[PDB]
Amino acid sequence: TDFLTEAHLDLPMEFESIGKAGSRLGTALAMAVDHEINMVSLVRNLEEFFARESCGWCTPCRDGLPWSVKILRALERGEGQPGDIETLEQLCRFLGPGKTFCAHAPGAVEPLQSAIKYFREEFEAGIKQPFSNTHLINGIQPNLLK
Amino acid sequence: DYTLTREIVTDPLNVFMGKLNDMVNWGRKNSIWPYNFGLSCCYVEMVTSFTAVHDVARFGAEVLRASPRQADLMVVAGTCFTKMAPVIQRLYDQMLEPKWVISMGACANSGGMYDIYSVVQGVDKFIPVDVYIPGCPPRPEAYMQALMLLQESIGKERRPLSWVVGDQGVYRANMQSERERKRGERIAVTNLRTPDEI
Numbered sequence A: 001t002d003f004l005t006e007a008h009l010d011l012p013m014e015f016e017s018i019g020k021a022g023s024r025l026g027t028a029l030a031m032a033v034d035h036e037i038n039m040v041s042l043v044r045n046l047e048e049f050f051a052r053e054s055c056g057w058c059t060p061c062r063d064g065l066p067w068s069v070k071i072l073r074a075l076e077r078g079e080g081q082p083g084d085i086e087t088l089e090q091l092c093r094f095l096g097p098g099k100t101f102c103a104h105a106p107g108a109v110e111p112l113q114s115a116i117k118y119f120r121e122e123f124e125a126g127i128k129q130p131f132s133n134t135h136l137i138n139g140i141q142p143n144l145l146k
Numbered sequence B: 001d002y003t004l005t006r007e008i009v010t011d012p013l014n015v016f017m018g019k020l021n022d023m024v025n026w027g028r029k030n031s032i033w034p035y036n037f038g039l040s041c042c043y044v045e046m047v048t049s050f051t052a053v054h055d056v057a058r059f060g061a062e063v064l065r066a067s068p069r070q071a072d073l074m075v076v077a078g079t080c081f082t083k084m085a086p087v088i089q090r091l092y093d094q095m096l097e098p099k100w101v102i103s104m105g106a107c108a109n110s111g112g113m114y115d116i117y118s119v120v121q122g123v124d125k126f127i128p129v130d131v132y133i134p135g136c137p138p139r140p141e142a143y144m145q146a147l148m149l150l151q152e153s154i155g156k157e158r159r160p161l162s163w164v165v166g167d168q169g170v171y172r173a174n175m176q177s178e179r180e181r182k183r184g185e186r187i188a189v190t191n192l193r194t195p196d197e198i
């Protein structure tokens, strides 16, 4: 389910009440994350659980949850690069209800988009090195993309 | 290891006749008169060789006759089109012995890139070639290298001195191939300059 802030704490636990709040009621067994626990590591652990316990039938969840897990691993170590958060948004948009075979993956990337929406400043702090996907090959001049 | 034309034979060669034949071959190889024959782009590189920056004139091969009777070298530098193949054959027939043929470029070698309805696939289909030059176009110095190859081929062939005495058959030497001769140095090449440099 989606993460919520203190402004959403004063809101009754129903189905329709959480329906327009940008989250789900779920099993109604909430868990509170304090200031000491960084949300980057928490979302990394959540996506690692959702990736290692996915069923692996359909392509977007099966081959995109490891990509998000590796992006969050890079953001944990400060090895983030420009083009990671946008990759997370594109994966979440392409993992919605019916975009995958079932609803396990929309529930998997509900915490990711929630932590993006509410705690984007904690994810941008992991981006430190510029985007270097290729390595220099001696004898071939690279195509300087603009 | 020679070749008879009127047969893989041996070296035919008084010791004065050998010196006379050597002097004749020296004079023939040091004065080679090509025939001015503009076929295609390979002729543009040929006349680039004839200019000042390369100076084929140094070898004594600058005269460039417009008449086939005076010339003794046919540089087929261009494509052998079907309409021009009888023209090339007639111009080769109008030449006088001794005469030598250099195919210049992939078109004259084998037809090259033009495996097409209107192109004869090589001038060796109808004309006996002496030296082949790969390239499209071969650079002017490649034409001069082929000229030197023709010179060293001429310098050891055996032709009759006079037409009233002696053996009238023409002996052409079977030269060792340039590929097998240069394989000893081409294979040993290890590093080349990278293409990013000037």
Ligand code: SF4
Pocket (backbone or CB within 6 Å): A054, A055, A056, A057, A058, A059, A061, A062, A100, A101, A102, A103, A104, A105
């Ligand atoms: S979205 Fe569901 S069906 Fe598709 S691979 Fe993931 S767990 Fe399996």
Ligand code: SF4
Pocket (backbone or CB within 6 Å): B040, B041, B042, B077, B078, B079, B104, B105, B106, B107, B108, B112, B135, B136, B137, B138
């Ligand atoms: S071999 Fe190439 S350069 Fe020479 S005549 Fe043919 S197309 Fe032109």
